[PDB]
Design a protein around this ligand. Structure first.
Ligand SMILES: NC(=O)c1ccc[n+]([C@@H]2O[C@H](COP(=O)([O-])OP(=O)(O)OC[C@H]3O[C@@H](n4cnc5c(N)ncnc54)[C@H](OP(=O)(O)O)[C@@H]3O)[C@@H](O)[C@H]2O)c1
Ligand SMILES: NC(=O)c1ccc[n+]([C@@H]2O[C@H](COP(=O)([O-])OP(=O)(O)OC[C@H]3O[C@@H](n4cnc5c(N)ncnc54)[C@H](OP(=O)(O)O)[C@@H]3O)[C@@H](O)[C@H]2O)c1
Lengths: 288, 287
């Protein structure tokens, strides 16, 4: 029954709380909306009135808030972190991880590790469900056992910023997948198809796309841009998705993809593979 | 078995090589005739014109860039009497109906539309699925020939269906690529190995793949309540932009940020990803 504090009782915060409770720990919680602790009071959880009193209560602080900005606001009056390990499970950018690591260090925190939970709340605590962890190996190692309450942790690096870097990279893929999937479902739906039957038909094709991704990552690393699926042809197919959508009276996502491919053609990269879009991104700070 | 092919691009040349490998008597036409050079050794006949290529065989395969190029290339093909047309040219549902009409008007026996769902290098593998729509009988007749490009799947008697499902599947592919390109740009600029990243990512991408049928049920059942609201997802998309700015790396997923923003405005911030589908079905708009 080690003492753990948890800041944030949102969708993911509350799933974290339940995992930590089941693990057999003595849990102090704080949330802006204290009512979100209501389902935890019966399970023997203490609700601290302020972030400060919450952090005082335990040597191990878990944070799972909306964002860095909300994390900075919440930690504002948390003056004393002596002998505390911070486990930050708040989505943010690599520098935001470094910024919170710095905020808690300046306040006497013993250590900081950052975690990206890669599943929705309902999956938290399945050994299958993976959380990526970055920060000092000894710090991970001391929290490993507690952290096993939320599923399998993968320590990806000693660098505090890395779990967030990989988080942002993986959420990029997820964002792209959902954008395409939502566009796919709007088209088949409006045209009077059953979305569940379409999904059964799509799943084998979506698995093939997943299997082509490593080959593409190799192409990117080796700057090998020639294949049988040029950007000119792919752009023509995206334009037909727009027209297909228009024909049905449905809206059109993938605009950034259309824009970056349109410009790619302009710069005489029209004959390159999808791997050729990566240098379009790495060489220019722009929102397509 | 006499087959005519119109189009010797990346996919057209792969089709040609499948049809040769399966013992067709191939006649070809392409705007750039030189693209038939690898086929002349193998005994293929090059026709001077679309008309003379179509004239040469009972069964016509078309694999051109677009509908526009197809109608422009069929401009002086005025006699399809006796011809069965297999159109493997990507296009809209309405374009498939237009070519079917265009080719009927000129005397074609029948017309089927197919959508090849693999790159040329995988064409001819039984694992490679080409969606076919059109008359069952017309498909039944061509099924044997088409076995050369892999496994064909007759999705509907309705000519427009292969192109409907094609556009739907290519939407997913374009999203997946958009995401992957963003991910690779981010981790590459950060000094990570793209191939080691891909190994790490693989389990996670397969997991996303598995989530999609559930989301389809949510869309059909109009069930938009879960533990992953759009406000939370938008916040994460915004962090991908800032992560990218930190690295001096460009950012895609613009239409995804935009539609989620409007969702939040319309009071749908609490909804799941499934709550985006009605944002699209309601309004003709580019996001
Ligand atoms: N599917 C998921 O839910 C999921 C999956 C993986 C990772 N994550 C990550 O987990 C983190 C939390 O996500 P969530 O799903 O728990 O989101 P959520 O349901 O929106 O909860 C957000 C949390 O942030 C707090 N908050 C927001 N604005 C605040 C403010 N201005 N001042 C103080 N507190 C504020 C909320 O307090 P109130 O309760 O008072 O609103 C709540 O505790 C995010 O960074 C997210 O990306 C989530
Ligand atoms: N490549 C793939 O991975 C892939 C996968 C699945 C489906 N497809 C679909 O298959 C079709 C063929 O794609 P592809 O990869 O063969 O594209 P491609 O390599 O761009 O070839 C385009 C073909 O259309 C011809 N063409 C273009 N503009 C023309 C014009 N104005 N007049 C006459 N002919 C013209 C080209 O002639 P020239 O040779 O003279 O330029 C060439 O034969 C497309 O609809 C595509 O979406 C492709």
């Amino acid at each position: 029954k080690p003492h753990v504090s948890l800041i944030g009782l949102g969708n993911m915060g509350l799933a974290i709380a339940n995992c930590l409770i089941k693990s057999g720990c003595k849990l102090t919680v704080w949330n802006r909306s204290a009512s979100k602790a209501a389902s935890l009071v019966a399970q023997g959880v203490t609700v601290a009135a302020t972030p400060a009193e919450c952090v005082a209560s335990s040597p191990t602080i878990v944070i799972c808030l909306l964002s860095y900005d909300v994390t900075q606001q919440t930690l504002d009056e948390v003056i004393d972190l002596s002998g505390k390990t911070i486990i930050n499970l708040t989505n943010g950018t690599p520098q935001q991880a470094v910024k919170v690591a710095t905020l808690v260090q300046q306040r006497g925190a013993e250590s900081y590790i950052h975690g990206a939970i890669m599943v929705p709340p309902i999956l938290l605590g399945q050994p299958s469900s993976v959380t990526l962890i970055s920060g000092p190996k000894t710090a991970y190692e001391s929290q490993k056992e507690l952290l096993s309450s939320i599923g399998t942790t993968r320590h990806v690096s000693d660098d505090i910023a890395k779990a967030s870097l990989l988080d942002n990279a993986l959420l990029s893929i997820m964002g792209g997948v959902f954008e395409g999937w939502v566009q796919a479902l709007a088209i088949v739906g409006k045209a009077g198809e059953d979305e569940v039957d379409f999904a059964a038909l799509a799943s084998p094709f979506v698995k093939s796309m997943a299997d082509w991704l490593p080959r593409i990552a190799g192409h990117v690393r080796e700057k090998q841009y020639v294949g049988g699926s040029p950007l000119t042809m792919q752009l023509e197919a995206l334009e037909n998705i727009s027209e297909t959508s228009r024909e049905l009276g449905v809206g059109v996502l993938l605009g950034s993809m259309r824009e970056v491919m349109s410009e790619a053609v302009k710069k005489g990269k029209g004959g390159e593979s999808i791997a050729g879009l990566v240098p379009m991104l790495t060489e220019l700070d722009k929102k397509w």
